[PDB]
Design a protein around this ligand. Sequence first.
Ligand code: CA
Ligand code: CA
Ligand code: CA
Ligand code: CA
Ligand code: ZN
Length: 316
Amino acid sequence: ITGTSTVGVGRGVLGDQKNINTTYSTYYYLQDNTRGDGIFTYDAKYRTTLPGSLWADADNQFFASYDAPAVDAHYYAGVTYDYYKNVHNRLSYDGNNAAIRSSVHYSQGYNNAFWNGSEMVYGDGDGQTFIPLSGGIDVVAHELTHAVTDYTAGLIYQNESGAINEAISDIFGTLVEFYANKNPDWEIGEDVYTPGISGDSLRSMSDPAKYGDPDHYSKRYTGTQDNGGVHINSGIINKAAYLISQGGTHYGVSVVGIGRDKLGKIFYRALTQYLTPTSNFSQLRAAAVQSATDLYGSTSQEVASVKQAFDAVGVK
Ligand SMILES: [Ca+2]
Ligand SMILES: [Ca+2]
Ligand SMILES: [Ca+2]
Ligand SMILES: [Ca+2]
Ligand SMILES: [Zn+2]
């Protein structure tokens, strides 16, 4: 919509108050003109027709409980935009400042969030397994990272390339959580998962096996469920990324940690310069080794740690 850029205030899903970039034209709309070609948040109104209506508010105040999921979808899209821009010099998900669009209140009791090829979509959860999914910065950045992958490597969402596509999203969702720096960790979705149970999440990168996911190639899932295990086998790659960053000894193989910033640089370069639609795990290892070599040199600690981390998870 055409109007002036304004600044609203509201509360997110977890009750935290934040400022949001809005646009004024009769109503105040959730349209942030300060990043690229805009961030636009829409109301799906408990339906599944997308995108729904661009979110309109009479007073630029967003404190109703109905407002909260939209507050977070809009705000965390902006944090994720800033991360790619400031850290990777990437402008929006296509690298050319594509508008970021998100719809909230999708369906009823919908326990999921996803990138549908054109936009973000967040369920409200059923109140038991999940609260509104946009309350988790790692969920928002995970799903927006699928948009980044779709425009770069284009890793096919099936078998090994699919599990890489999933892992990349867990990695950058986690790195966005650390960048924003509010209670960061190596688990996925903890802020919105199971309001009755402390300390759980959907997945762990530091210990994938905590939730039944393989942490070594010898344990890969080889069946047909979950598109050949894209959410299951990502654990192998998540554990390798965790080891590259943090270090540790995993099945007797020691890895020297190089930190989050270098992990992010190595995997961003692999993503955008080396991976292709059909890349398998062993090709990811080569891309990550070539990436670390370009960035740090072939004799570097960085290259050696990458090689160690993939050895530790059984990937040659
Ligand atoms: Ca209002
Ligand atoms: Ca956290
Ligand atoms: Ca997390
Ligand atoms: Ca919980
Ligand atoms: Zn995903």
